[PDB]
């Protein structure tokens, strides 16, 4: 009764052949005649100084002004990016915080890491002081990423190879997303919030149905860990960043890889990815000192953000599209346009 082992290989071939049948022309062939973007030369407009050690994560508030960052110094800082002043500095229990998130409402932030817990902080208490409103316990491995759906719902990814949807009020996992065979490193919610994508150390990305808890599609191609993942702004595609020194673009409806973004002299891993507002530019952070701005349609490197003295660990583009934030192991965030 290991016709199941044959059957698995039959189905893998059918999927491969179905994908191949849809591969009639490449994205590059299709975008060959459009004008290139030209030289993108963004400048550092603001530097956020205040962290005492490596920055590990950041996330913009939906107002395109406030952002939260997490650091080895054991602080979560909420920054006013326009003035460079801090708004809040939240002391954490440990240094080893790997992710932070800003709720779309602006009412809460979240973070976690080697504690294996997603902590939720109320920014708008009656007292006027920030304090822990919930500690989401359940993962049996490190918290790698988290993103609020709303004030009562957050999605987490973990080194335990699962993702989960949480009801914050009850503190319970409402849905558990099982399927990955390696540490899950990053997640990105679809614009409409019905779907999300995860990237993991099994070198695959998975599309999940949020309500029904099922993996709908699995995307392969990367040769090593996927560390970063981000939806294209219309929700029909997403980009990944990997230890294999490439970013890749995957399409949901064609169910396959559309493009690789790479260069012969890039040997190090990608830590973070994000699209510009229109999706035309793909920005990626690297283990060396820089961020590369890629033409997402043509795969040309349009530019470089060179202003850190160590790893660019994280980045994000504002909802209004006005600026990119980079966070680094050199202990600074920088705001670029």
């Amino acid at each position: 009764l290991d016709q199941l082992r044959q059957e698995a290989e039959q189905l893998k071939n059918q999927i491969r052949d179905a994908r191949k049948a849809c591969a009639d022309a490449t994205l590059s062939q299709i975008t060959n005649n459009i004008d290139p973007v030209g030289r993108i030369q963004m400048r550092t407009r603001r530097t956020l100084r205040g962290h005492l050690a490596k920055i590990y994560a950041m996330h913009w508030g939906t107002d395109s002004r406030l952002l939260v960052s997490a650091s080895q110094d054991g602080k979560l800082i909420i920054w006013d990016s326009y003035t460079t002043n801090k708004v809040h500095a939240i002391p954490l229990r440990s240094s080893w915080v790997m992710t932070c998130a800003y709720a779309p409402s602006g009412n809460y932030v979240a973070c976690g890491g080697l504690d294996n817990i997603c902590s939720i902080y109320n920014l708008k208490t009656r007292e006027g002081n920030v304090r822990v409103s919930r500690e989401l316990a359940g993962h049996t491995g490190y918290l790698s990423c988290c993103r609020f759906l709303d004030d009562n719902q957050i999605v987490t990814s973990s080194g335990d190879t699962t993702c989960a949807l949480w009801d914050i009020e009850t503190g319970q996992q409402t849905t558990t997303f099982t399927g990955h065979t390696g540490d899950v490193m990053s997640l990105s919610l679809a614009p409409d919030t019905r779907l999300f994508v995860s990237g993991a150390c099994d070198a695959s990305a998975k599309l999940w149905d949020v309500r029904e808890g099922m993996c709908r599609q699995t995307f392969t191609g990367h040769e090593s860990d996927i560390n970063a993942i981000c939806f294209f702004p219309n929700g029909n595609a997403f980009a990944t960043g990997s230890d294999d020194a490439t970013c890749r673009l995957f399409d949901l409806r064609a169910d396959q890889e559309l493009m690789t973004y790479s260069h012969d002299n890039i040997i190090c891993g990608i830590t973070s990815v994000s699209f510009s507002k229109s999706g035309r530019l793909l920005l990626a952070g690297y283990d060396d000192f820089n961020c590369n701005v890629w033409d997402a349609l043509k795969a040309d490197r349009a530019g470089v953000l060179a202003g850190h003295d160590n790893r660019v660990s994280c980045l994000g583009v504002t909802d209004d599209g006005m600026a990119v934030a980079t966070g680094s192991w050199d202990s600074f965030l920088k705001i670029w346009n």
Partner: peptide, 13 residues
């Protein structure tokens, strides 16, 4: 698994 997290955090041991 801890090894990936140590690389991400910049720890050695």
């Amino acid at each position: 698994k801890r090894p990936k997290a140590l690389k991400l955090l910049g720890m050695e041991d």
